[PDB]
């Protein structure tokens with residue numbers, strides 16, 4: 001009844017390149033009106049995600065506005081025409097805030113370069129989640145990154161027995177999940193991680209290879225490693241990097257190769273905006289590049305297919321999806337800085353329980 | 355069975371960039387052994403093609419060897435196990451030679467940048483060709499260039515009623531062929547030409563807009579021309595140029611767009627090897643670029659479907675595909691140089707009746 005005090009991380013200052021996490025965000029205590037519309041709801045946050053692509057959303061965020069992010073919430077209060085009743089556990093884009101008010105409807109990301117539209121709020125069912133498939137997973141293998149990997153692999157990539165596969169950024173959850181289904185469909189999987197230790201992790205997961213981009217800073221050194229990592233060329237490629245790794249990949253594309261472009265760390269974070277033209281290398285191969293935007297998939301029928309196919313496999317230990325959950329609402333911008341600095345200590349999907 | 359005297363245009367000198375035709379080719383007279391293998395044939399040449407991709411075939415061809423090219427041939431004498439009997443009209447890569455011997459089996463072009471294998475020799479069936487679809491068109495609409503355009507449009511691109519479509523290099527036969535098939539599928543077709551007339555010529559063909567790259571050297575000057583020619587963004591794009599023009603397209607790709615990359619005149623001829631990284635422009639669009647290499651379609655099943663589909667449209671004038679047939683064996687390299695120029699006589703497929 002009335003109002004309540006919440007806390008938000010809000011954009012203090014726009015800073016390009018690798019984020020200066022403690023200089024860009026600022027915690028503030030905001031008063032939130034708890035008088036609700038016909039279809040609004042009051043939500044408490046239980047978990048938030050922190051992903052490298054928040055780096056872009058930050059640059060498009062107006063100063064002072066809370067930093068958006070993928071989150072798990074719980075309905076505290078609900079309007080009369082509310083999409084969800086109280087208690088309901090939902091997954092959505094509540095951002096870095098302890099509380100918030102929302103109609104839950106799909107809304108337009110007006111400030112974007114591209115007119116993005118955050119989906120509506122997915123209702124969650126506790127029954128699906130248990131000790132082995134925790135509720136914390138609706139942000140990973142049972143949430144965003146898992147939809148991205150499973151989708152690319154059922155809806156776009158026909159992986160065949162005998163394919164060489166390259167997964168740039170294989171360390172993260174999406175990279176690792178992609179590689180697993182790659183091997184699962186009987187495919188030589190090659191990866192990239194950044195520390196010798198992370199290397200063994202993937203290597204323990206079935207990665208027939210890993211590579212240190214840290215020690216392969218020019219596309220030349222990289223082609224070298226790659227020709228050896230993939231002695232039979234490249235059949236499929238799930239890219240989240242670009243710039244030098246990708247320039248080398250395209251130079252060995254088998255015929256009928258598929259490429260899925262999921263992100264471009266090189267261009268986005270490290271700001272490599274000019275490079276060698278890759279389009280001329282795809283013609284003779286008849287490669288098929290596709291841009292990935294996993295939101296195109298957040299259909300109700302689609303979420304079930306993930307639980308149904310992915311959910312089982314995961315709980316039978318057959319499919320690995322670790323999640324590294326840091327505690328405390330206040331450490332959120334610091335968890336965000338680990339993706340760009342202390343990621344060697346990170347294993348799987350980074351989250352924060354609030 | 356003795357010998358015979360022939361004439362060949364042979365690669366005298368490699369010159370990258372725009373070809374210097376009278377400096378690169380040298381007419382020569384070679385004597386040909388008239389003893390045939392088990393599956394070989396003696397071939398007299400009737401017509402030859404001249405295409406811009408011959409700029410590449412030239413640069414990989416060893417100095418002194420005949421210039422390969424698309425041709426129409428006729429069996430003079432044939433071994434016992436020949437794929438075709440004498441008198442038969444065959445279509446293959448006989449190059450700029452008055453005569454030649456060949457078994458017609460597929461052969462490998464190893465000295466290339468990419469290790470291609472020229473297809474097997476096609477027999478031409480007179481029933482297909484008539485006054486209105488002359489035998490010469492098996493080098494144009496009824497041969498390679500038509501297969502490329504028809505393939506890309508039946509096998510890859512779903513154009514819908516109401517799509518904007520872009521065609522780089524829209525002047526040539528494939529581009530003009532492509533734009534036309536688009537217009538039939540209810541598609542606003544936008545093109546690029548080099549002369550006020552060539553632009554009108556396309557406009558006469560159904561092109562809802564045209565733009566002069568001759569004026570638009572900057573992706574910025576281009577984006578502007580483009581943003582206005584394609585006010586609703588780009589739904590499909592048939593690329594044969596690249597560089598500044600493609601840079602401008604990717605900056606306005608609609609959602610679900612398809613791209614067919616067929617050639618890169620800019621990269622190939624104009625040597626534009628580095629430019630802005632385009633992959634960041636395909637993720638939100640969920641663009642689906644595919645490289646085009648029409649050779650994958652050289653099946654009998656397909657050639658019949660081409661004649662059956664394209665031949666009809668063409669003979670009822672619903673589909674226009676002019677051919678500028680220059681006569682005379684000696685005039686071949688000069689007929690080649692008509693591309694690479696501001697000739698309004700460069701209308702349709704350039705050929706040489708020998």
Ligand SMILES: NC(=O)c1ccc[n+]([C@@H]2O[C@H](COP(=O)([O-])OP(=O)(O)OC[C@H]3O[C@@H](n4cnc5c(N)ncnc54)[C@H](OP(=O)(O)O)[C@@H]3O)[C@@H](O)[C@H]2O)c1
Nearest residue numbers: 053169171172173174175193194198262263292293294343
């Ligand atoms: N397109 C879409 O619709 C969509 C949807 C969701 C996510 N995504 C994106 O897809 C990616 C995968 O997600 P995730 O959760 O698994 O992220 P993630 O892989 O954990 O992202 C950070 C990781 O990337 C690696 N990395 C950093 N710089 C690198 C470089 N120069 N070369 C190679 N690897 C480098 C590091 O691995 P090491 O620790 O081994 O260095 C680090 O741990 C993310 O970028 C995410 O934003 C896209």
Ligand SMILES: NC(=O)c1ccc[n+]([C@@H]2O[C@H](COP(=O)([O-])OP(=O)(O)OC[C@H]3O[C@@H](n4cnc5c(N)ncnc54)[C@H](OP(=O)(O)O)[C@@H]3O)[C@@H](O)[C@H]2O)c1
Nearest residue numbers: 406407523525526527528529547548552567617646647648
């Ligand atoms: N991948 C495959 O399997 C495959 C198969 C066959 C052909 N191809 C290639 O695809 C291309 C299309 O064939 P085509 O018969 O239609 O050739 P074409 O377009 O007639 O080739 C020359 C024409 O391109 C134009 N041009 C030159 N520079 C340009 C620029 N900067 N911007 C825009 N247009 C420019 C000129 O048109 P204006 O006269 O208006 O200036 C010129 O007349 C050829 O290069 C061919 O080699 C590929």
Ligand SMILES: CC[C@H]1[C@@H]2C=C[C@@H]3/C=C/C=C/C(=O)NCCC[C@@H]4NC(=O)/C(=C(O)/C=C/C=C/[C@@H]3[C@H]2C[C@H]1C)C4=O
Nearest residue numbers: 053056057070093113144145268293294295634637638
């Ligand atoms: C319910 C949450 C859902 C996420 C919400 C937003 C995320 C978008 C981030 C956008 C960044 C941006 O525009 N930055 C500036 C442009 C740079 C660059 N260009 C791109 O086209 C691009 C991308 O497509 C990036 C896609 C990420 C997809 C994410 C969604 C998946 C899903 C889990 C880039 O990042």
